């Protein structure tokens, strides 16, 4: 499902400020990462990224194409392709705690300035 900036901002409050990343930064990162599509599936190079956060099956979630994966998040990648974001967020938090915001390649180039436009004013 393709969500709106505000739908996303409202669903990821538990991640707000986590590891120093604000909601405006995430709204910005998620747009470039998945276009806010909860069902986005992108292959990288022998690996696949899933959902809103584009969590990869290389180390984070277990896929069927790569069952031996470390599955650090302890979750089936298919669980990252639905509209229930609590497990996507929990896995993202592990990525942030372990690897850091740099996992998301769009952060630096696309989300270093002009952050105010990413704010959601809808209550």
């Amino acid at each position: 499902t393709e969500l709106t900036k505000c739908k996303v901002s409202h669903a990821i409050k538990d991640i707000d400020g986590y590891q120093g990343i604000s909601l405006l930064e995430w709204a910005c990162v998620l747009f470039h990462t998945s276009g806010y599509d909860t069902q986005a599936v992108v292959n990288d190079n022998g690996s696949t990224e899933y959902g809103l956060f584009q969590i990869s099956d290389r180390f984070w979630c277990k896929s069927s194409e790569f069952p031996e994966s470390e599955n650090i998040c302890g979750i089936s990648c298919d669980k990252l392709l639905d509209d229930e974001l609590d497990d996507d967020i929990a896995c993202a938090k592990k990525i942030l705690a372990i690897k850091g915001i740099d996992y998301w390649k769009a952060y630096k180039p696309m989300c270093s300035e002009k952050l105010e436009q990413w704010r959601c004013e809808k209550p």
């Binding site: 709106t4 910005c28 747009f31 470039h32 992108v42 292959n43 990288d44 190079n45 390649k105 769009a106 630096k108 180039p109 696309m110 002009k114 436009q117 990413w118």
Partner: protein
């Protein structure tokens, strides 16, 4: 005869854009008798100061083109532009390269006429209001600002994708567009970064005037998200100097002049 008015007295404002009823290019040509072979049109009524070459990156989008042609020729004539249509078709089945095809368009269009303005447009975007002029302005112009695909709102202030217009000088000033972006995404952000580095800002009509519809479609194989796009976008400042019009190389395989447009098929290489 004299210069065309600053604003065309032919504009109708908003328009209904639909992709239901099938298109008959023969019908379209019939309804646009003034357009000459190759898709060229010059106002008879007055003299237009906007000599516009419209460049469309293309590969296997014939159905989309019909709609594009069906809606744009009437709009463009109403806008009183001295224009030409160019479909730059990528030969082969390697990764699609939108920006590179746009550079080719610029080079090739200049062989036909003394163009001073270039509109780069995706084959599937149709403007919903003829006040959104397809010509160039004092600053790089972003035309598709409110796309129905993004819910009629610009996705971010730095977004330059879809339809844009740069005068010959603006384009020259940034060494044109990048040739190294293979596959989907990022090339528009790279172009945005070049304009800014050269001290330009982006001009846009407001979001009501700038409403556009994008024909609905699935992603194309051979144009999957480019994994290196974000890293490439971070270095534009250094790469724009060496990757652009000044390093463009390609081979022309065929030039087709149709009554409604010129289709140039090119071999642009592969991911280097």
């Amino acid at each position: 005869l004299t210069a065309c008015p600053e604003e065309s007295p032919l504009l109708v404002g908003p328009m209904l854009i639909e992709f239901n009823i099938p298109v008959d290019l023969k019908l379209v040509e019939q309804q646009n008798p003034k357009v000459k072979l190759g898709g060229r049109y010059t106002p008879m009524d007055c003299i237009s100061p906007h000599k516009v070459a419209i460049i469309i990156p293309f590969r296997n989008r014939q159905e989309h083109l019909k709609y594009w042609l069906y809606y744009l020729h009437p709009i463009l004539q109403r806008q009183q532009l001295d224009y030409g249509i160019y479909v730059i078709n990528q030969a082969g089945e390697s990764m699609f390269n939108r920006a590179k095809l746009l550079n080719v368009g610029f080079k090739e269009a200049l062989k036909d006429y003394d163009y001073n303005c270039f509109v780069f447009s995706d084959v599937d975007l149709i403007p919903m209001n003829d006040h959104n002029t397809y010509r160039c302005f004092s600053q790089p112009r972003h035309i598709s600002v409110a796309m129905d695909k993004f819910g009629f709102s610009l996705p971010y202030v730095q977004y330059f994708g879809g339809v844009s217009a740069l005068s010959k000088q603006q384009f020259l000033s940034i060494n044109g567009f990048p040739n190294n972006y293979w596959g989907w995404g990022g090339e528009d952000d790279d172009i945005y970064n070049r304009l800014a580095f050269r001290g330009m800002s982006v001009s846009r009509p407001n979001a009501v005037i700038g409403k556009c519809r994008m024909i609905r479609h699935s992603r194309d194989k051979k144009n999957e998200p480019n994994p290196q796009r974000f890293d490439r976008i971070a270095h534009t400042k250094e790469t724009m100097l060496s990757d652009g019009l000044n390093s463009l190389t390609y081979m022309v395989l065929e030039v087709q002049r149709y009554p409604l447009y010129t289709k140039i098929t090119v071999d642009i290489g592969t991911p280097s």
